[PDB]
Design an enzyme around this catalytic site. Structure first.
Site, PDB file in Angstrom:
ATOM      1  N   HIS A   1       0.825  -1.204   0.000  1.00  0.00           N
ATOM      2  CA  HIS A   1       0.000   0.000   0.000  1.00  0.00           C
ATOM      3  C   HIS A   1       0.860   1.254   0.000  1.00  0.00           C
ATOM      4  CE1 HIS A   1       0.299   1.979   3.967  1.00  0.00           C
ATOM      5  NE2 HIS A   1       0.803   0.826   4.356  1.00  0.00           N
ATOM      6  N   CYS A   2       0.206   2.359  -0.327  1.00  0.00           N
ATOM      7  CA  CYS A   2       0.844   3.671  -0.184  1.00  0.00           C
ATOM      8  C   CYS A   2      -0.226   4.559   0.429  1.00  0.00           C
ATOM      9  CB  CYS A   2       1.426   4.180  -1.492  1.00  0.00           C
ATOM     10  SG  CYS A   2       0.317   4.282  -2.913  1.00  0.00           S
ATOM     11  N   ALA A   3      -0.520   5.741  -0.101  1.00  0.00           N
ATOM     12  CA  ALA A   3      -1.641   6.458   0.517  1.00  0.00           C
ATOM     13  C   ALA A   3      -2.957   6.070  -0.146  1.00  0.00           C
ATOM     14  CB  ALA A   3      -1.399   7.954   0.451  1.00  0.00           C
TER      15      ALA A   3
END
Length: 169
Positions: free
Chosen positions: A113-115
């Site tokens: 994931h990232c944002a």
């Protein structure tokens, strides 16, 4: 040999109406956002064993190893910016390797994931497919993009092309 425009067009041409917090984009391999990142429960549901935080850092999605305390899962933090001038590619191989050894675990279910799960983490997932699933960039994208709208930034795309390229040879 694709151009940037062709990839972006592709990145546009195939996009659903909405985006979910997490998505299995490949068997035992999930692309998620920071919401899903902290969604301890769904994590449990899914049986995630490894979380790849590509938005890691106090100044970003500060989840870390501690956030998962008690939880039976391993963590990888990558302190990257979603900027075209940020060199994500230096993370390309090691992450491919991390994600690989994980999925190589029977229970191996990885979250990357990232944002918002569409660019920074998208990109690292792509490279992994190219590098370890014998895919190409377009194939990577078409594969990944079948379950989750994605859109690595121009510079991340440029980063991938280069990788596509090293692999072409």
């Amino acid at each position: 040999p694709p151009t940037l425009a062709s990839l972006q067009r592709l990145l546009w041409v195939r996009q659903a109406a909405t985006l979910n917090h997490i998505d299995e984009v490949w068997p035992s391999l999930f692309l998620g956002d920071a919401y899903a990142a902290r969604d301890k429960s769904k994590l449990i549901q899914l049986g995630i064993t490894h979380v790849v935080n590509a938005a890691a850092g106090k100044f970003q999605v500060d989840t870390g190893a501690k956030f998962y305390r008690g939880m039976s899962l391993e963590y990888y933090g990558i302190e990257a910016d979603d900027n075209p001038f940020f060199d994500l590619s230096v993370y390309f191989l090691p992450v491919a390797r991390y994600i690989r050894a994980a999925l190589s675990v029977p229970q191996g279910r990885v979250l990357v994931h990232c944002a918002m799960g569409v660019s920074r983490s998208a990109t690292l997932v792509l490279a992994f497919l190219m590098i370890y699933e014998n895919m190409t960039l377009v194939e990577a994208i078409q594969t990944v993009q079948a379950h989750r709208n994605i859109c690595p930034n121009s510079g991340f795309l440029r980063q991938l092309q280069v990788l596509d390229n090293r692999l072409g040879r």
